[PDB]
Amino acid sequence: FHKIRNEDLIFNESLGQGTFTKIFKGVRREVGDYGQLHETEVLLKVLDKAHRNYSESFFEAASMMSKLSHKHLVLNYGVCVCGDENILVQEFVKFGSLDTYLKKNKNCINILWKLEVAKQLAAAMHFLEENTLIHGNVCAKNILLIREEDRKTGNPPFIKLSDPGISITVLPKDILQERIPWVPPECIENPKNLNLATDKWSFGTTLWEICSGGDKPLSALDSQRKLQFYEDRHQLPAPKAAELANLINNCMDYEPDHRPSFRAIIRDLNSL
Ligand SMILES: Nc1nc(Nc2ccc(S(N)(=O)=O)cc2)nn1C(=O)Nc1ccc(OCC(=O)O)cc1
Numbered sequence: 001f002h003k004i005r006n007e008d009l010i011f012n013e014s015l016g017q018g019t020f021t022k023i024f025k026g027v028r029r030e031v032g033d034y035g036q037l038h039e040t041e042v043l044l045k046v047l048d049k050a051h052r053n054y055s056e057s058f059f060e061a062a063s064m065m066s067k068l069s070h071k072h073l074v075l076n077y078g079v080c081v082c083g084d085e086n087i088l089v090q091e092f093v094k095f096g097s098l099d100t101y102l103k104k105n106k107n108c109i110n111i112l113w114k115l116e117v118a119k120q121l122a123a124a125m126h127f128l129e130e131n132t133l134i135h136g137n138v139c140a141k142n143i144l145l146i147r148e149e150d151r152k153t154g155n156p157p158f159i160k161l162s163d164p165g166i167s168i169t170v171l172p173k174d175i176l177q178e179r180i181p182w183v184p185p186e187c188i189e190n191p192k193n194l195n196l197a198t199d200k201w202s203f204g205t206t207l208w209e210i211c212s213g214g215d216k217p218l219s220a221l222d223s224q225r226k227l228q229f230y231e232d233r234h235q236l237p238a239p240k241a242a243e244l245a246n247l248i249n250n251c252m253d254y255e256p257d258h259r260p261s262f263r264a265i266i267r268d269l270n271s272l
Contacts, residue, residue: 001063002078004028004089009080011044015096019137019165019175020051021058028077028089041092042077045163046085054166055086061136061164062088068131072124074144074160093160095145102140103214111243113149114210116156118244119269124161125203126262129196135164136194138202139182140209169194180226181205181217181236186256188230197256203265204251211239211248243272 008029015023024044032038047055059079066076080087095101098117102109121143128135138161147158168176168183169191176183176191184201186193208217217236218226233254238245247268253259260268 001059001066001076004078004080006080006082009042009044009087009089015043018045018141019171020048020054021165022046022048025092026089040077043090043092044080045088045090047087049084052086054170057166057170059086059088061167064133065128065135065163068127068133070124070127072120072127072160074162076163088163090163093144093146095148097141097162098143098145098159099140099209099214099216101145101214102210102212106213109213111241113157114241114244115269115272116149117143117159117210118207119266120159121161121203121206122262122266122269125199126266128199129262132196134194134196135161135199135202136168137165137179137182138199138206140206140214143206167194174223177223177226180223180230181252184252184256185230185254188227193256195256197259200251200259200262200265201253201256203262204248205236207244207248207251208236208239211241211244 010027012025012027015025017023024046026042026044028040028042030038030040047058062076065073074093075091077089077091080089125138142162144160144162145157146160147155149155149157168187176188180188182202182205184198187198205217218229221229235249235252247265251259251265
């Protein structure tokens with residue numbers, strides 16, 4: 001990662017929190033192309049000082065994905081390691097995370113919008129699968145909306161997948177349980193079961209989010225009941241808009257080896 005000076009970063013408003021991180025909108029002063037000076041909006045992801053032990057996991061995962069440039073993968077500008085904070089300096093996506101976008105725009109979003117976003121997310125995941133890179137935290141919060149749909153120009157929405165974050169292979173067990181049903185059953189049984197098949201399960205959960213107006217599946221269940229949900233081998237309820245429910249359930253297969261390839265997922269999406 002390119003090293004960015006603290007003096008060249010301005011921290012502005014808080015945009016919430018991630019997993020052991022605090023999120024800020026900011027500005028980066030930089031020399032750009034042709035030597036032109038720019039002040040660039042950036043997303044600043046700040047690893048909590050009280051969790052400095054997780055620093056390696058978060059930045060290594062952001063790094064590994066940043067080694068694969070792709071139109072549906074978020075761009076990382078570099079890191080700021082000045083002072084006592086570890087900061088990922090990321091592109092600022094205008095419309096933020098999809099989980100909040102789905103809630104705020106539930107009435108406006110139709111099946112065509114959902115299918116397009118699903119197709120784009122599957123394209124990103126197919127790219128990762130072909131490169132044998134595990135994301136490990138596919139969820140609507142980690143889908144960033146670059147561009148809204150514009151029916152006036154027929155422009156579809158455009159999304160990117162955010163950085164993996166701290167690996168579930170090092171996260172505390174209680175955070176993993178709260179991340180049911182995005183974390184697949186085999187990773188609850190053993191977080192070292194993390195595998196490409198992990199992302200197929202979480203992709204199913206993410207489609208469920210996309211189809212559920214920003215609702216969080218199983219949010220009414222506490223961590224103990226989420227554990228028992230997997231023990232009893234339940235599936236998620238079909239979303240009211242059920243057009244993707246079969247695909248959701250096919251992806252959320254309790255047998256990891258039976259989960260379909262992203263190529264097959266894409267073929268299925270193209271058939272709707
Ligand atoms: N690159 C980027 N650009 C924006 N732009 C943005 C954000 C919010 C708004 S808001 N509030 O006014 O609606 C508007 C714009 N967000 N962003 C992200 O990476 N967010 C993000 C933050 C934390 C995450 O954590 C996941 C986890 O670690 O569990 C995941 C994702």
